[PDB]
Design a binder for this molecule. Structure first.
Ligand SMILES: *SC[C@H](NC(=O)CC[C@H](N)C(=O)O)C(=O)NCC(=O)O
Ligand SMILES: N[C@@H](CCC(=O)N[C@@H](CS)C(=O)NCC(=O)O)C(=O)O
Lengths: 352, 338
């Protein structure tokens, strides 16, 4: 009773040399859920690379029923870092009891699908390939011209977004931002690989396990690898403390990252899990030896620095979508669909 | 539901008079209400006077169940603590998962009920204070059982130290009763009204109420710690803790009744009953100190607290909360050291 994630089927790229998918403003779209850490990676990267006006964004409802992600039945919204969803601008979730699973609050629960009016993401999948027979996942990077799915693998979408493909369409400060610098690329790929299996996906192999033996194995594995991240960050903090002195908290945080001394894709990919860990994964996926906030001081400093001090993280993080999606959609974990109010707050302030 | 058997034991009682070897206490180690009675039985020196047996932690549709002298007169009926995945719900580890029922060989606690009252139609709860002579239930309300135990009824059969222990001293009775009253509604029962709510509106109301009242207990204890620190100095933790209680400056029934909820809070109520604004260990330092002092320094608390029974009971029995019956491994540890 283990969880075996399907492999994504749409794995193409965008480039000037490409025969079909060439770069342009106003041609590609990013369809996401704000609940989904994989899709979350693509929203952070789109903001950091200055692509919000180049690639529009729409947002499915947080509630996932048996027919898959759905939309509700504007230029500021499409080019907003979170598709215009108002809760992503908030730093904490509030009451949930009055929100039903059929809630239809336009630009709060979801956006529409603004090009074809589709009600289901499955519609995009079947437009691209009428013979598709896998799961209808987010994120989707969509090409308006051919009406196909270019890529639905978040690890590749974020490399496309960071690549030179869209450089003609952004300001030179954003062009220069590089989330996968060559000097760090192999370290980034090494770190990503083990964080993928043991944390990003590890929390899902833990929470979706249907046999307790598999639950126990996977939860032990999650916390063993958080310990490894904590160790990496603790050693890094110690070196920064030596370099700049404990009193210079702002120069220290300016270099306080998982890989190297700059923000990279490694931080983005870890963040989308860690920022969900205390709000959902502890209670809902039973990943509860300890919490980030209580048990992992260096991870907790690192994630708070990213959340509070980087708009691309803060304003793509929607704690209402996060909590409601998991607790209201996973009937075999939470049969009555009651969303826990805690922990409070969703992410603590960065107190010095 | 309100408990049906509400009799007492006393030298004047027409039926139930005090004696050694006459009365029995049937408990679950998972149930906080029954846990109150075990703690009180130990504090009052009654383990040889009043035997104990222990139902299985798993609660199925036919009610609490048993497996098919050193143990009877032990603080926890002889149960010893042995991952959870290898433990199935029908596990049969003698003196680990449960005891038998030694007097009649009954497999079900409903058998005791039906013997006492063949027309019984309510729930088959623990704790049960049983009379071996008449084969009836004397009392099945934990708040009364602990007053029977603390009363003068069994004084002839205990040593002189225990006879003198008074968990409800008259000098503190209005303070104890006041604290017990709101702690019962908002904390002891508050966690169940939260965890068993079937409508989110009810869950949210009750969980806010739980933490609002934990805040009140925390203030009480914070204020008490402040005065103790000034009276003894902060380095003299031993003298301070010897007076660090919820009511007064001595150990009372108020501490006992609070403890059986607080000791279950981080191991289970946070995750399982969604009482998760914060945890005791992370969010309530004075409660946290108070509960560790009782657990680590008082044998009547420590050796009646079984974290395996606690975590397994709730996670394995409540199908509408945890449909697959997978017991979370955390938090680690069950109770932090002192
Ligand atoms: S903790 C398990 C339950 N005990 C009680 O409800 C005792 C409540 C009394 N008010 C008391 O003694 O304090 C229990 O036994 N549940 C079984 C059931 O079927 O409800
Ligand atoms: N490997 C994919 C995983 C994407 C994914 O699985 N998303 C989940 C939710 S976060 C989803 O869309 N699930 C829909 C389903 O499986 O029905 C990626 O990284 O992009």
């Amino acid at each position: 009773g283990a969880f075996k994630r399907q492999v994504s089927s749409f794995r193409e790229t965008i480039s000037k040399q490409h025969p079909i998918y060439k770069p342009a403003k106003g041609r590609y779209w990013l369809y996401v859920s704000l609940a989904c850490p994989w899709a979350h990676r693509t929203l952070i990267t789109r903001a950091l690379k200055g692509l919000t006006s180049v690639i529009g964004c729409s947002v499915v409802h947080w509630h996932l029923d048996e027919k898959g992600w759905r939309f509700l039945d504007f230029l500021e919204h499409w080019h907003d870092v979170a598709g215009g969803i108002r809760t992503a601008k908030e730093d904490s979730s509030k009451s949930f009891a009055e929100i039903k699973n059929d809630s239809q609050r336009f630009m709060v629960d979801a956006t529409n699908e603004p090009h074809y009016g589709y009600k289901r993401i499955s519609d995009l999948y079947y437009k691209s390939d009428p013979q598709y027979s896998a799961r209808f996942t987010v994120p989707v990077l969509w090409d308006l011209e051919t009406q196909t799915i270019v890529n639905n693998e978040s690890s590749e979408i974020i490399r496309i977004l960071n690549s030179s493909a869209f450089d003609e369409f952004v300001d030179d400060d954003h062009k220069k931002t590089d989330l996968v610098p060559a000097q760090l690329k192999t370290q980034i790929d090494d770190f990503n690989s083990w964080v993928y299996d043991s944390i990003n996906n590890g929390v899902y192999k833990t929470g979706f396990a249907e046999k307790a033996e598999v639950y126990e194995s996977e939860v032990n594995n999650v916390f063993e690898h958080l310990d490894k991240v904590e160790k990496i960050l603790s050693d890094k903090y110690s070196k920064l403390k030596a370099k700049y002195g404990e009193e210079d908290r702002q120069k220290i945080l300016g270099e306080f990252f998982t890989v190297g001394d700059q923000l990279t894709e490694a931080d983005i990919r870890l963040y989308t899990t860690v920022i969900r860990f205390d709000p959902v994964y502890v209670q809902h996926f039973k990943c509860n030896f300890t919490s980030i906030r209580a048990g992992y001081p260096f991870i907790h400093l690192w994630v708070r620095n990213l959340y509070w001090n980087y708009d691309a993280f803060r304003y793509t993080t929607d704690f209402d979508h996060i909590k409601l999606h998991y607790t209201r959609s996973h009937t075999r974990i939470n049969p009555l669909g009651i969303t826990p109010l805690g922990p409070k707050p969703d992410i603590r302030p960065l107190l010095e």
